[PDB]
């Protein structure tokens, strides 16, 4: 399948060169897989989700996404127009409030919830968790992310937006999960993106168009936008039977576009998420 005039990020992950506008993908499109978006929630009613989205857990008075951040990331995972895996099932877990904030104990609870909840769901092709959040280093936050990954969920997490070494941030610094840096449309590391040896892979993160609350759309920037690209790609590749949850991150690095990115500090991987699609 081909999506013409696609968002730049989608075109990029189906190409070996920047500057193209068509997203090429297999028509299976993540069907039979599930992605939990652990964030501010998801506006499940947005027409772009086609009824494939649902809220399963909230830690606040409402399950409603009153921010937009969660809806944006879920959109990049698997909305019709802006999504990598256009037929995946989306599950919303609201651990962040409508200001984009949450405490560590809640985020940990949300991760443990997903580890258990996936056992109640029909996800024959596998389970992915997308974590577009983080803060200062915490061993117990890192531990919860390791547990979720261990439980058989492919965990992808934002490197963070501090133009610093991601080793001082959590869950980004947990070696066992898939830590995602951001790139822009000219194959440069995003100016805000964290880096370092703990990074596994880069994804499109600058100027990413996706779903927003109120049934709208907008373009925003962040390693938060890069993460759902990788999480969506994992779901896609698991549906195609090319990899499993335990090995998806490694498989994504092995088959990545290598050496194409600029402004990568020495000691950071030069690897860009790539679907390796051939009609």
């Amino acid at each position: 399948a081909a999506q013409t005039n696609a968002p730049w990020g989608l075109a990029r992950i189906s190409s070996t060169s920047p500057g193209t506008s068509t997203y090429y993908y297999d028509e299976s499109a993540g069907q039979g897989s599930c992605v939990y978006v652990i964030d501010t929630g998801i506006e499940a009613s947005h027409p772009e989700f086609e009824g494939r989205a649902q809220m399963v857990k909230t830690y606040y008075y409402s399950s409603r996404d009153g921010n937009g951040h969660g809806t944006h990331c879920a959109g990049t995972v698997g909305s019709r127009t802006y999504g990598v895996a256009k037929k995946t099932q989306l599950f919303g877990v609201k651990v962040l409030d409508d200001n984009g904030s949450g405490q560590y104990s809640t985020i940990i609870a949300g991760m443990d919830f997903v580890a258990s909840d996936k056992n109640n769901r029909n996800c024959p092709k596998g389970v992915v968790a997308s974590l577009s959040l983080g803060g200062g280093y915490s061993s117990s936050v890192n531990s919860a992310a390791a547990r979720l990954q261990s439980s058989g969920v492919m965990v992808a997490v934002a490197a963070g937006n501090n133009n610093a070494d991601a080793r001082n941030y959590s869950p980004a610094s947990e070696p066992s999960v898939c830590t995602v840096g951001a790139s822009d449309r000219y194959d440069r590391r995003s100016s805000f993106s964290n880096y370092g040896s703990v990074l596994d892979i880069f994804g499109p993160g600058t100027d990413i168009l996706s779903t927003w609350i109120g049934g709208s759309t907008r373009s925003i920037s962040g390693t938060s936008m890069a993460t759902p690209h990788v999480a969506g790609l994992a779901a896609y590749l698991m549906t195609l039977g090319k990899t499993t949850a335990a090995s998806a991150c490694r498989y994504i690095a092995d088959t990545a576009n290598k050496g194409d990115l600029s402004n990568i500090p020495f000691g950071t991987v030069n690897l860009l998420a790539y679907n390796n699609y051939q009609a």
Binding site: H69, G100, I107, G134, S138, N161, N162
Partner: peptide
């Protein structure tokens, strides 16, 4: 935990 909320 303490990263993004609105800040550009």
């Amino acid at each position: 935990g303490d990263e993004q909320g609105e800040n550009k």
